[PDB]
Tab-separated table of C-alpha atoms in Angstrom:
chain	number	residue	atom	x	y	z
A	1	UNK	CA	-18.566	3.227	15.948
A	2	UNK	CA	-15.635	1.313	17.380
A	3	UNK	CA	-15.571	-1.505	14.791
A	4	UNK	CA	-15.557	1.098	11.983
A	5	UNK	CA	-12.782	3.258	13.528
A	6	UNK	CA	-10.516	0.504	14.860
A	7	UNK	CA	-10.734	-1.458	11.615
A	8	UNK	CA	-10.022	1.742	9.669
A	9	UNK	CA	-6.965	2.492	11.776
A	10	UNK	CA	-5.680	-1.091	11.439
A	11	UNK	CA	-6.164	-0.919	7.663
A	12	UNK	CA	-4.522	2.489	7.325
A	13	UNK	CA	-1.470	1.157	9.178
A	14	UNK	CA	-1.269	-1.852	6.861
A	15	UNK	CA	-1.552	0.572	3.900
A	16	UNK	CA	1.348	2.629	5.288
A	17	UNK	CA	3.420	-0.565	5.748
A	18	UNK	CA	2.511	-1.522	2.144
A	19	UNK	CA	3.728	1.904	0.930
A	20	UNK	CA	6.982	1.558	2.903
A	21	UNK	CA	7.776	-1.697	1.058
A	22	UNK	CA	6.594	-0.262	-2.246
A	23	UNK	CA	9.082	2.612	-1.995
A	24	UNK	CA	11.836	0.200	-0.940
A	25	UNK	CA	11.654	-1.317	-4.466
A	26	UNK	CA	12.971	1.923	-6.010
A	27	UNK	CA	16.501	1.922	-7.501
A	28	UNK	CA	18.768	4.135	-5.378
A	29	UNK	CA	22.408	4.984	-4.570
A	30	UNK	CA	23.336	2.787	-1.587
A	31	UNK	CA	21.963	-0.532	-2.848
A	32	UNK	CA	19.332	-2.564	-0.996
A	33	UNK	CA	17.646	-5.989	-1.500
A	34	UNK	CA	14.316	-4.244	-2.261
A	35	UNK	CA	15.347	-3.061	-5.747
A	36	UNK	CA	15.824	-6.719	-6.760
A	37	UNK	CA	12.334	-7.831	-5.623
A	38	UNK	CA	10.509	-6.803	-8.826
A	39	UNK	CA	12.978	-8.803	-10.967
A	40	UNK	CA	11.741	-12.259	-11.975
A	41	UNK	CA	12.957	-15.346	-13.928
A	42	UNK	CA	11.128	-18.246	-15.574
A	43	UNK	CA	11.445	-20.844	-12.804
A	44	UNK	CA	10.155	-24.201	-14.079
A	45	UNK	CA	7.097	-22.661	-15.802
A	46	UNK	CA	6.173	-19.957	-13.270
A	47	UNK	CA	7.689	-16.464	-13.172
A	48	UNK	CA	9.502	-16.223	-9.898
A	49	UNK	CA	11.143	-13.367	-8.056
A	50	UNK	CA	14.796	-13.766	-7.630
A	51	UNK	CA	14.448	-12.514	-4.086
A	52	UNK	CA	13.132	-16.013	-3.594
A	53	UNK	CA	15.772	-17.863	-5.620
A	54	UNK	CA	18.993	-16.329	-4.213
A	55	UNK	CA	20.543	-14.689	-1.120
A	56	UNK	CA	21.165	-10.981	-1.750
A	57	UNK	CA	24.019	-9.467	0.268
A	58	UNK	CA	25.187	-5.841	0.363
A	59	UNK	CA	28.814	-5.445	1.487
A	60	UNK	CA	30.262	-2.080	0.417
A	61	UNK	CA	27.928	0.867	-0.303
A	62	UNK	CA	27.608	0.462	-4.102
A	63	UNK	CA	28.513	-3.231	-4.428
A	64	UNK	CA	26.023	-6.123	-4.200
A	65	UNK	CA	26.842	-9.864	-3.930
A	66	UNK	CA	24.178	-12.489	-4.795
A	67	UNK	CA	24.347	-16.259	-4.220
A	68	UNK	CA	21.852	-18.445	-6.123
A	69	UNK	CA	20.412	-21.292	-3.985
A	70	UNK	CA	20.553	-23.662	-6.970
A	71	UNK	CA	23.835	-22.928	-8.809
A	72	UNK	CA	22.540	-23.706	-12.339
A	73	UNK	CA	20.044	-20.809	-11.972
A	74	UNK	CA	22.900	-18.241	-11.847
A	75	UNK	CA	22.855	-17.543	-15.625
A	76	UNK	CA	19.093	-16.791	-15.706
A	77	UNK	CA	19.198	-14.750	-12.459
A	78	UNK	CA	22.216	-12.710	-13.664
A	79	UNK	CA	20.480	-12.286	-17.065
A	80	UNK	CA	17.327	-10.996	-15.329
A	81	UNK	CA	19.427	-8.505	-13.342
A	82	UNK	CA	21.119	-7.434	-16.621
A	83	UNK	CA	17.813	-6.917	-18.463
A	84	UNK	CA	16.075	-5.164	-15.552
A	85	UNK	CA	15.564	-1.396	-15.335
A	86	UNK	CA	18.202	-1.095	-12.564
A	87	UNK	CA	20.885	0.165	-14.992
A	88	UNK	CA	23.515	-2.281	-13.727
A	89	UNK	CA	25.806	-4.832	-15.367
A	90	UNK	CA	26.523	-7.959	-13.310
A	91	UNK	CA	29.539	-10.283	-13.458
A	92	UNK	CA	30.158	-13.668	-11.811
A	93	UNK	CA	32.868	-15.908	-10.385
A	94	UNK	CA	31.145	-19.206	-11.288
A	95	UNK	CA	29.073	-19.305	-8.077
A	96	UNK	CA	28.399	-15.699	-6.987
A	97	UNK	CA	26.828	-12.919	-9.084
A	98	UNK	CA	28.645	-9.608	-8.491
A	99	UNK	CA	26.545	-6.476	-9.181
A	100	UNK	CA	28.189	-3.044	-9.245
A	101	UNK	CA	25.727	-0.213	-8.616
A	102	UNK	CA	26.752	2.853	-10.689
A	103	UNK	CA	25.854	6.399	-9.706
A	104	UNK	CA	22.437	7.442	-11.043
A	105	UNK	CA	22.394	10.021	-13.831
A	106	UNK	CA	20.702	13.228	-12.627
A	107	UNK	CA	18.765	12.557	-15.763
A	108	UNK	CA	17.456	9.334	-14.055
A	109	UNK	CA	16.980	10.590	-10.484
A	110	UNK	CA	14.114	12.885	-11.304
A	111	UNK	CA	12.489	9.919	-12.988
A	112	UNK	CA	12.801	7.771	-9.946
A	113	UNK	CA	11.709	10.739	-7.784
A	114	UNK	CA	8.526	10.820	-9.893
A	115	UNK	CA	8.010	7.083	-9.304
A	116	UNK	CA	8.437	7.569	-5.541
A	117	UNK	CA	5.858	10.378	-5.545
A	118	UNK	CA	3.459	8.211	-7.606
A	119	UNK	CA	3.715	5.288	-5.166
A	120	UNK	CA	3.019	7.770	-2.370
A	121	UNK	CA	0.016	9.099	-4.310
A	122	UNK	CA	-1.347	5.535	-4.660
A	123	UNK	CA	-1.154	4.759	-0.930
A	124	UNK	CA	-2.623	8.135	0.136
A	125	UNK	CA	-5.589	7.518	-2.162
A	126	UNK	CA	-5.939	4.075	-0.539
A	127	UNK	CA	-5.828	5.658	2.945
A	128	UNK	CA	-8.530	8.144	1.847
A	129	UNK	CA	-10.724	5.281	0.603
A	130	UNK	CA	-10.398	3.465	3.924
A	131	UNK	CA	-11.515	6.697	5.642
A	132	UNK	CA	-14.461	7.116	3.247
A	133	UNK	CA	-15.596	3.541	3.958
A	134	UNK	CA	-15.416	4.148	7.745
A	135	UNK	CA	-16.974	7.605	7.272
A	136	UNK	CA	-19.932	6.200	5.335
A	137	UNK	CA	-20.385	3.720	8.188
A	138	UNK	CA	-20.346	6.599	10.706
A	139	UNK	CA	-22.949	8.401	8.569
A	140	UNK	CA	-25.161	5.298	8.477
A	141	UNK	CA	-24.935	4.890	12.267
A	142	UNK	CA	-26.119	8.514	12.748
A	143	UNK	CA	-28.915	8.161	10.137
A	144	UNK	CA	-30.271	5.016	11.793
A	145	UNK	CA	-29.848	6.537	15.279
A	146	UNK	CA	-27.597	3.692	16.440
A	147	UNK	CA	-25.417	6.193	18.406
A	148	UNK	CA	-25.700	9.674	19.976
A	149	UNK	CA	-25.120	12.714	17.749
A	150	UNK	CA	-22.119	13.859	19.870
A	151	UNK	CA	-20.769	10.275	19.936
A	152	UNK	CA	-20.587	10.198	16.112
A	153	UNK	CA	-19.318	13.818	16.067
A	154	UNK	CA	-16.393	12.666	18.214
A	155	UNK	CA	-15.736	9.560	16.089
A	156	UNK	CA	-15.777	11.663	12.927
A	157	UNK	CA	-13.150	14.086	14.299
A	158	UNK	CA	-11.110	11.149	15.579
A	159	UNK	CA	-11.271	9.397	12.156
A	160	UNK	CA	-10.160	12.589	10.387
A	161	UNK	CA	-7.128	13.045	12.693
A	162	UNK	CA	-6.097	9.405	12.258
A	163	UNK	CA	-6.360	9.766	8.439
A	164	UNK	CA	-4.237	12.956	8.389
A	165	UNK	CA	-1.840	11.102	10.708
A	166	UNK	CA	-1.329	8.350	8.138
A	167	UNK	CA	-1.410	10.518	5.007
A	168	UNK	CA	1.470	12.495	6.573
A	169	UNK	CA	3.416	9.320	7.363
A	170	UNK	CA	3.176	8.423	3.672
A	171	UNK	CA	4.384	11.924	2.706
A	172	UNK	CA	7.277	11.431	5.144
A	173	UNK	CA	8.243	8.078	3.596
A	174	UNK	CA	8.280	9.671	0.127
A	175	UNK	CA	10.216	12.777	1.242
A	176	UNK	CA	12.724	10.388	2.881
A	177	UNK	CA	12.901	8.451	-0.409
A	178	UNK	CA	13.231	11.582	-2.547
A	179	UNK	CA	16.134	12.433	-0.209
A	180	UNK	CA	17.803	9.037	-0.675
A	181	UNK	CA	17.418	9.578	-4.458
A	182	UNK	CA	19.176	12.969	-4.391
A	183	UNK	CA	22.216	11.736	-2.455
């Protein structure tokens, strides 16, 4: 009973954390390092995220400043940022890549709102699957008479509450993202 519930809770929480970082990769007004994570260059044979290859810094609200660890990688990093879906055009002063974040077209906000809702959908499905796995275990325990009927009844109601708890948190994260998109 306990192994199944505690493990389910621990996994749900990881899944919520995973969703939080997933949403943080969405292009938004008020730039963040997350939106750069998806972007990747050919780094000596292996595609590498430029989150790994540079130090992203966000001074002003819609102004990003990026410093490549190995200077000769600037061109490729700046080119990757140019050819990404971020809708930005970088410049450089020989050492630092300067990225100006333009305002999103209302035409592109709904599109990124739909991506934020989809990422939420993914994680909620994953939370539901974790519940189902724990729930099947609870059903097996009752079938085999490995715990009292009321004991499992209690665990079932606890498991449901926990699931709702974490499905809502995901909804909250998406609502908060949808808000950041329409700002």
